Design a protein around this ligand. Sequence first.
Ligand code: CL
Ligand code: CL
Ligand code: CL
Ligand code: MN
Ligand code: MN
Ligand code: MN
Ligand code: MN
Ligand code: MN
Ligand code: MN
Ligand code: MN
Lengths: 98, 99, 106, 104, 95, 92, 77, 84
Amino acid sequence: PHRYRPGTVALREIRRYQKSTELLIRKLPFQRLVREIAQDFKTDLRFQSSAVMALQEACEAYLVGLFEDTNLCAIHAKRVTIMPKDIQLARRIRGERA
Amino acid sequence: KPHRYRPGTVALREIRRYQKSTELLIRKLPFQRLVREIAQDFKTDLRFQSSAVMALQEACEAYLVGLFEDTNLCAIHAKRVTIMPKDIQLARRIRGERA
Amino acid sequence: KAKTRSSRAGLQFPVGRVHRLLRKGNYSERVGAGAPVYLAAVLEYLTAEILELAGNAARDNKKTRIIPRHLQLAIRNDEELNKLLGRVTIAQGGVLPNIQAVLLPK
Amino acid sequence: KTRSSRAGLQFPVGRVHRLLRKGNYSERVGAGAPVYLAAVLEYLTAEILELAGNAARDNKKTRIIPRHLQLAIRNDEELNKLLGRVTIAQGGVLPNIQAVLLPK
Amino acid sequence: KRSRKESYSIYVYKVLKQVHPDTGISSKAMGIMNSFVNDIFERIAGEASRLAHYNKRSTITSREIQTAVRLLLPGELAKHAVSEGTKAVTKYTSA
Amino acid sequence: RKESYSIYVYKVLKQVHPDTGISSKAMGIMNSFVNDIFERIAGEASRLAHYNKRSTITSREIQTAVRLLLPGELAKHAVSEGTKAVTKYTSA
Amino acid sequence: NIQGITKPAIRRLARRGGVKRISGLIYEETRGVLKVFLENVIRDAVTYTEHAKRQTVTAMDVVYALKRQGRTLYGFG
Amino acid sequence: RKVLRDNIQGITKPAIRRLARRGGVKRISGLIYEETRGVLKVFLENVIRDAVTYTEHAKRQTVTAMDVVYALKRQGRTLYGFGG
DNA sequence: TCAATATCCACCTGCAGATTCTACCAAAAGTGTATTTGGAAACTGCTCCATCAAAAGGCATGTTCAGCTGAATTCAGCTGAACATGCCTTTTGATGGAGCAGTTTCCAAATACACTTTTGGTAGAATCTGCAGGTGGATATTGAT
DNA sequence: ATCAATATCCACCTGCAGATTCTACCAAAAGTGTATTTGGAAACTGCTCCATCAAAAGGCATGTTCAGCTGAATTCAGCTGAACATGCCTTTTGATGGAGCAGTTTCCAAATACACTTTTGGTAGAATCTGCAGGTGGATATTGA
Ligand SMILES: [Cl-]
Ligand SMILES: [Cl-]
Ligand SMILES: [Cl-]
Ligand SMILES: [Mn+2]
Ligand SMILES: [Mn+2]
Ligand SMILES: [Mn+2]
Ligand SMILES: [Mn+2]
Ligand SMILES: [Mn+2]
Ligand SMILES: [Mn+2]
Ligand SMILES: [Mn+2]
């Protein structure tokens, strides 16, 4: 039998994704999410095929950054697991909230 | 004979004292030199408008008082009550200043 | 016999000024007739809205004269104004009394 | 006779002169302004394509793609500051794993 | 030989009386106010120029100013803003 | 017809890396870049003008703009590269 | 539909982010911030579609909005 | 007159301490004092540089309030109170 | 170290799939000429800034002490990563009929424009008064015993 | 659970520094009569965009295990707050000299207006080139005895 010790796939995972540049969220779900949000503002709306990519990109790209800032906040607290609180401080600092 | 406060009593005292005020905390003159000095080193023989200085001091202190909160938040985020350089680097790092 | 366009739209702000600054400031080739009006209003409104809270803050501190501090408190307690003026700093303004929770004695 | 070749550049001084009188930047635009700007533009484009180019080879490809442009930017400090609040589409981050997280 | 400088100072005062008849405002505070106006002015007008440009239209209608406000001001403040805005334009147009 | 700095960029590319090419998306990135810088430089240029009550944007403005916008060395090479381009244009 | 952004995804994200361990609580908290982000971007974007007198949201609309939010995006005109 | 030299040390400790109370800080690590000057100096430079640049582009030998302001503005650290 | 297991890096290899080069054309840049005009080169006017004096006590600095904070360890209840499984939205590959984004072609309304009145807005000396800076009795809170 | 010891609180108080009014100038809104052109308003044309339809597959979701992370609880060396004495500046207010900021005057070299010629710089088109993604051996790493 064989198994990689806890937190080793993650590393191989980090290196993996950091190496790529492909989107991670799933297209279809995301669109459904977009379009849905857009409703609260204007109905019967069509989105340029790429107008979603723009959103898709801007989005993944924003989160990843927020994560890096979150990871630093987790570490700074002597931890190694990002928690909701980190994600918050990260933002309370960016000026995004409070 | 004599009295004496436990450490923290005057800190919280001052924190209250200065958040209720809006006076500049740095001494004007020392700040002025620093300013002329720095300017001095970009273009010599510069003259400053009495206010140009005030603007800068007003802006500076605010930037820091602002920097110190985000700092104090980081000390507390690591279950500490004393801000440390570790904390200023983070604040600034996350802000995007010294990435 | 002429009348300021300000009154025509019944505003307290200089509707003529605004139109001029829209031109002397080159923002666009031309400028509608209501542009200065509309904007002038939005400006009068916002200025009116923060003067209302300032004067209150000024009334609480127990004085009859708005000063920078009051404008800080005003702008800093109203969620919406605070966001409008998030990356702004009021000279002589100060900060809102606020000791972090975990620092207080136990 | 193209004002551009005149000033010895690849970027459109002409066009640029056109975009200036459009943007509603100032009532009138000086003759050298377009030129000067175009150059400044061509320059940075050169600075970027170069570095990016190296990244393309450093990876072994011959077609410069976003990932190369991205590496080229964030790797260099100056550009990284210039384009600090910008995000390259199809860019990816730069390899980075905090020491603390590391094994053994 | 004089060089008189402008300011929205007289008007802030007119509005101050409207919301606080007895209340008065200091020089510095008046200064803070005056800045506020120009800032906001610059923002809205800017946001405007862009809409107009982004839209190949060469003029800033009071309609751009509005979309500017909607884009610039946060919710409630925007409602009210827009309100007072239309109320002044329509009234105006009726000589 | 829609325009872009697609061709010019390509010239500069084939001028420092004759051997290599450039992806469409990369071109779209590079393209988005020129424009941004353009706007940044032209804006700050515009304000430089206004602040000083001038109704014409000159090289002097652009330059300063460039001084204000671009960081460290990036600043200098640009300014140079720019002033250079100026004289050489005025000569012919 | 926000639950559509599956956990595994939010995690791959935190990977590119450089995160090793993840608190199960994150996943919702993250779905939270994300929606705010999109609510913000689209409202400002749609407004553009609107003022533009259209029924179709273009990339530009998204782009201009991103710039507004200080999230400049290169690569889509 | 006299030569302006290492004046950052003017921004004493009592002060940095103060700026930190109004900031809400109750306990200050001793190494903080030197860090603050570290940043105060960087901040002050960046703002002042842009200012003077503005001063130069206006062929003036004096730094004016507006300069300092168009400066802070540029830096995204917009100030009100001298703004005019 | 010694392996058994699993991931990973690396020559090596044959195509649409984007890429890149062409072959032609409106839109746009060049140029010729002519008509304004922004604002740079001198000159004073005369604020606003530099400096200097001087006397005072507001503050800074440095030292002694020790309260209590940070930081180092120890411990085990579990949270969340690794892994194996099972079932299902996602990806995709056209296809269709058309909602709409755009292109023209005019044109009535909306602006720019140039001059001449007709006033608000300013700047500058009146003429006030908030409230700053003390002055002192009550709370209110702290910390010793 | 009391009781000094300090600091925080307010209400008065009173002069003057900072408003708040009170009058004389124009830079600048306001009219009116044109001259220009802007951006809807029909109206037509092809995109591009939903909207099905139908399969294979990654992908996702669950549930099982337990490695080792996060948290709470002590503990002790030292750091950083408090308090105090010392006496070094920073303030304060005014005075004087004068750089140089900032209103005028002018000319010029430079920029803007028309409109009449060439070149581009985009568009599909046509002819290529690459990085794709599949292999599959050959190490690298992990991990366990
Ligand atoms: Cl949490
Ligand atoms: Cl209008
Ligand atoms: Cl020029
Ligand atoms: Mn020096
Ligand atoms: Mn502790
Ligand atoms: Mn009058
Ligand atoms: Mn008092
Ligand atoms: Mn002189
Ligand atoms: Mn050609
Ligand atoms: Mn491959």
